[PDB]
Fold plasma retinol-binding protein.
Amino acid sequence: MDCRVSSFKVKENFDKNRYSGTWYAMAKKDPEGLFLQDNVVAQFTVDENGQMSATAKGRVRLFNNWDVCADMIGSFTDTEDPAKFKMKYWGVASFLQKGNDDHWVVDTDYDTYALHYSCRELNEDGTCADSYSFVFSRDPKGLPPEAQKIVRQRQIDLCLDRKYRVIVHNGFCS
Ligand SMILES: CC1=C(/C=C/C(C)=C/C=C/C(C)=C/CO)C(C)(C)CCC1
């Protein structure tokens, strides 16, 4: 049971165009502090020069109770690893958070599911101190019993097992 971040294995030869399109977040594992809550849908596209970007809608509560529908946007720069990106994000609205997080795709089938992960804070022993993860599906209705078994194994080998929470979509942002 090695939970060092550098130990985690990511998607072999990640194909940036097979991955583009609409993805629906079905479950998540939260990080410390302020973060997207529900009704979150992401849209990936890749330009002619291979650059990948994405926009995202989601409900987020602020200060104290203030649900707003955050329109986020991120760009991705490539690393020595096809699956491991650096993502710069920001919102159409200014008060919304800007920032830079790693963006790694641990696993995907590009036809039905994608499993994302990001460690914002590394510990002294290499394991992650503060992290979040997303489980996306191409189908707004969710994964098959059989794709769910793959997903739950991924969560365990990430040491995030039993820490995910089902995301719901009730047109709060449509
Ligand atoms: C770029 C965007 C993503 C992440 C957004 C997050 C990090 C937003 C947080 C917003 C907050 C907390 C705003 C507070 O005012 C993910 C990874 C889903 C995939 C594609 C595009």
